Amino acid sequence: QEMFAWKMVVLSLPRIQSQRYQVGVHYELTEEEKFY
Amino acid sequence: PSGKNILVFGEDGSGKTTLMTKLQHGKKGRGLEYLYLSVHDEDRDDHTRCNVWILDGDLYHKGLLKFAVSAESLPETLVIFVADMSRPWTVMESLQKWASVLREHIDKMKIPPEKMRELERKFVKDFQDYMEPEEGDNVLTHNLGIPVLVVCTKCDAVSVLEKEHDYRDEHLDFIQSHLRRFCLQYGAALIYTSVKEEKNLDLLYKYIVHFTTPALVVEKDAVFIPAGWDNEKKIAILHENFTTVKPEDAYEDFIVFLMKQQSLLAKQ
C-alpha cells in the first residue's frame, strides 16, 4: 500500500536553492565557518 | 498497521548520515532528507514504512517540519534527538534547542485540531503510566509529551574524551547523569549508539511504536536508559561521588584632514 507520497509532493521542491538569502550583504556569506 | 514516523534531528552532521547508513548516501548539509525504513515485524516484512526525516541546520526549518509532520500522523512520531558526545556543550545546548523546536512545532502546528489536544494529553498521561512498569514515583516532567527517545552519537570515544579534556569520571558522569535527568524530565529515555556498536535503538523504537531490552550501567561506557528506569534518587547518587551535587557553574567549565590641520597649526 506504498502510495501516499502526495503529502510530500504537495510542497516537495519549492525551495531547492534557498541558501543565499544573507540580508543582501552580510559580509560573510557562508552557511558555516572556517578553521582558526 | 498504519504509517509510522521518525524525525531524526542532526546537529551539523554529527554522524547522522553514518548512523542512518548503519541501519540499512550523499551527505547531510541542507535539510529534510527523507529516509524509508524496513524493520522486521516479528514474523515477516509487513512493510513498516517508518518515515525518517533528517533535519539539520536552523535556516527556516519550520517549513521542513510542516512538510515532515501531518495532522493524523502525530501519535506514531518517534523523534530522535541526536547529539554527538565529542562536543558535550553541543549536547547540553542542542538537546534543549531541539526540545524548544519541538515545543514551537506543537505550539504552532498541533493547535488547530481541538479533539486531538484533549485526546493526546490524556494519551500522554496514560502512556507515562505504562512507561515505568515492565522494565528490567513522580519526577519533574515538563509540558512536552509524545513518545520520545534521545540517542547520543560518538559514545565509543571514552578514551578520546578523557585524553582531550575530561581525564576524570566527573565529565562522563556529569553527561550521563544530566542526560538521564533531561530524558526523565522530557518524558523520554536514552539509548547510546556508536560506530558499529551499541545496537539497542531498534529494540526500544520498535517496542514503543506498537522485543525488549535491559539496562546497562555496569560498563559505564555503553549506557542505556530504557523506558522506565528513572527516578530522583539514582540520578543524585550518580553525580555525587567526587562530582558537585547539582552545580550551576560547571556548565561553563565543561563547555587631507589630519595632515592639513597639522600643517595649518605649524603655519599659524
UniProtKB/Swiss-Prot annotation, chain A:
Domain of life: Eukaryota
Compartment annotation: Cytoplasm, Cytoskeleton
Domain notes: Dynein heavy chains probably consist of an N-terminal stem (which binds cargo and interacts with other dynein components), and the head or motor domain. The motor contains six tandemly-linked AAA domains in the head, which form a ring. A stalk-like structure (formed by two of the coiled coil domains) protrudes between AAA 4 and AAA 5 and terminates in a microtubule-binding site. A seventh domain may also contribute to this ring; it is not clear whether the N-terminus or the C-terminus forms this extra domain.
Record note on quaternary structure: Homodimer. The cytoplasmic dynein 1 complex consists of two catalytic heavy chains (HCs) and a number of non-catalytic subunits presented by intermediate chains (ICs), light intermediate chains (LICs) and light chains (LCs); the composition seems to vary in respect to the IC, LIC and LC composition. The heavy chain homodimer serves as a scaffold for the probable homodimeric assembly of the respective non-catalytic subunits. The ICs and LICs bind directly to the HC dimer and dynein LCs assemble on the IC dimer. Interacts with DYNC1LI1; DYNC1LI1 and DYNC1LI2 bind mutually exclusive to DYNC1H1.
UniProt family annotation: Belongs to the dynein heavy chain family.
UniProt function note: Cytoplasmic dynein 1 acts as a motor for the intracellular retrograde motility of vesicles and organelles along microtubules. Dynein has ATPase activity; the force-producing power stroke is thought to occur on release of ADP. Plays a role in mitotic spindle assembly and metaphase plate congression.
Illness the protein is tied to: Charcot-Marie-Tooth disease, axonal, type 2O: An axonal form of Charcot-Marie-Tooth disease, a disorder of the peripheral nervous system, characterized by progressive weakness and atrophy, initially of the peroneal muscles and later of the distal muscles of the arms. Charcot-Marie-Tooth disease is classified in two main groups on the basis of electrophysiologic properties and histopathology: primary peripheral demyelinating neuropathies (designated CMT1 when they are dominantly inherited) and primary peripheral axonal neuropathies (CMT2).
Name under which the protein is recorded: Cytoplasmic dynein 1 heavy chain 1
Taxonomic source organism: Homo sapiens
Shown residues within the full chain: 984 to 1019 of 4646
UniProtKB/Swiss-Prot annotation, chain B:
Family indicated by similarity: Belongs to the dynein light intermediate chain family.
Function according to Swiss-Prot or TrEMBL: Acts as one of several non-catalytic accessory components of the cytoplasmic dynein 1 complex that are thought to be involved in linking dynein to cargos and to adapter proteins that regulate dynein function. Cytoplasmic dynein 1 acts as a motor for the intracellular retrograde motility of vesicles and organelles along microtubules. May play a role in binding dynein to membranous organelles or chromosomes.
Entry superkingdom: Eukaryota
Major place of residence: cytoplasm
Binding site residues for ATP: G10, E11, D12, G13, S14, G15, K16, T17
Keyword Nucleotide-binding in record: yes
Protein name: Cytoplasmic dynein 1 light intermediate chain 2
A biological process from GO: cellular response to nerve growth factor stimulus
Keywords: ATP-binding, Cytoplasm, Cytoskeleton, Dynein, Methylation, Microtubule, Motor protein, Nucleotide-binding, Phosphoprotein, Transport
GO molecular function: ATP binding; dynein heavy chain binding; identical protein binding
Cellular component terms per the entry's GO annotation: centrosome; cytoplasmic dynein complex; cytosol; dynein complex; kinetochore; late endosome; membrane; microtubule
Keyword Transport: yes
UniProt subunit comment: Homodimer. The cytoplasmic dynein 1 complex consists of two catalytic heavy chains (HCs) and a number of non-catalytic subunits presented by intermediate chains (ICs), light intermediate chains (LICs) and light chains (LCs); the composition seems to vary in respect to the IC, LIC and LC composition. The heavy chain homodimer serves as a scaffold for the probable homodimeric assembly of the respective non-catalytic subunits. The ICs and LICs bind directly to the HC dimer and the LCs assemble on the IC dimer. Interacts with DYNC1H1; DYNC1LI1 and DYNC1LI2 bind mutually exclusive to DYNC1H.
Annotated localization: Cytoplasm, Cytoskeleton
Residue numbers of the full-length protein present here: 52 to 373 of 492
